[PDB]
Design a protein around this ligand. Structure first.
Ligand SMILES: [Ca+2]
Ligand SMILES: [Ca+2]
Ligand SMILES: [Ca+2]
Ligand SMILES: [Ca+2]
Ligand SMILES: [Ca+2]
Ligand SMILES: [Ca+2]
Ligand SMILES: [Ca+2]
Ligand SMILES: [Ca+2]
Lengths: 213, 213
């Protein structure tokens, strides 16, 4: 069977269903009457009826909103028959790809991270790792592409930015010098994770840094 | 033959050739090895070589720029053979749609239009028409949606805007009162037409209005 170039349908559609996607038909329909149908998971097997096809015209339709994060892709088969029951084409394998949107917010693996730095440590040294996940499509979009930032430091001393976060790795490093356990022994950072490479949906967690001797 | 939904390729592509459009497989290639070719005008028929298919992968490719205004649609057929050159699928009908770019400036039907009006005529009274054409796709885009403007009036008396042009139709009308043949017996307007509804490519021409008793 040929495999159709994929038919895209974005997730979370609203309004009137069903909606037309694409017309799939046989160029033999002037030689004999052609009746169309589709089978497979999403047509006549679970989930039944998400897609339906017009029996005489071959208009493929979707009957409800989709969620890429539940099902990313459907495989079905179209069929062309004539009155006498002969198949007028081999089946075609129909591929339908659910096209992503940014409908998922990043999430930190924990609501509080804990680390230790040694007070005499060099601007460069690695303190700790923070971690988020996005459920969206990390292959075809930036909707799951996470920029880690530091939003705030407490206390703001000796300097405001004692610390640096690598925006891709979520690794927290020492930016700056004057780090003394006995002046200021614990810092509480508010860290942000935002998708769209930093520009999109965001969430915050806390990172608690204990200064050591 | 199944006829696949059409594949869009914009005119006036730039850079590296060939470029990939779509992957056209058969799913009988787990079993033995399948070889692809294409025929049709645009492939093995004139214009020869605009599209090719990579024999082993089935990537359909475009080999040079297209121009919608010369050819807007191609029809190709793909074929699937085994090493002995025997068909393992019926052919598949491939439709290619060339999509529009705004690569055509509107042209006024004439370089100078002539019209005339009675000095008595009341504001709102209709004088003459100006007219432009645009060669871009006036069915699916705004690349031919022309808006009309008066750029200048000569002379600027008794007042600067004796006239008005409806931006959608090109009808020139009397805007303000005071027309009088024996003070100013003709006006020369520069008129402008622009696509994208005024926002796009532009051209100008002249309209000459003879004030009559
Ligand atoms: Ca979703
Ligand atoms: Ca997201
Ligand atoms: Ca999503
Ligand atoms: Ca100390
Ligand atoms: Ca063109
Ligand atoms: Ca064009
Ligand atoms: Ca145009
Ligand atoms: Ca007079």
């Amino acid at each position: 069977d040929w495999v159709i170039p994929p038919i895209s349908c974005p997730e979370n559609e609203k309004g009137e269903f069903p909606k037309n996607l694409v017309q799939i038909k046989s160029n033999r329909d002037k030689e004999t009457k052609v009746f169309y149908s589709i089978t497979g998971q999403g047509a006549d097997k679970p989930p039944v009826g998400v897609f339906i096809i017009e029996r005489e015209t071959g208009w493929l339709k979707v009957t409800q909103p989709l969620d890429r994060e539940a099902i990313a892709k459907y495989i079905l088969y179209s069929h062309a028959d004539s009155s006498n029951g002969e198949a007028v084409e081999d089946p075609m394998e129909i591929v339908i790809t659910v096209t992503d949107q940014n409908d998922n917010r990043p999430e930190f693996t924990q609501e509080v991270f804990e680390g230790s730095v040694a007070e005499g440590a060099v601007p460069g040294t690695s303190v700790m790792k923070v971690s988020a996940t996005d459920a969206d499509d990390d292959v075809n979009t930036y909707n799951a592409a996470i920029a880690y930032t530091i939003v705030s430091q407490d206390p703001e001393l000796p300097h405001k930015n004692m610390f640096t976060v690598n925006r891709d790795t979520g690794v927290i490093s020492v930016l700056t010098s004057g780090l003394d356990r006995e002046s200021y022994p614990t810092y509480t950072l508010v860290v942000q994770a935002a998708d769209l490479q930093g520009e999109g949906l965001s969430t915050t967690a806390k990172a608690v840094i204990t200064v050591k001797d």
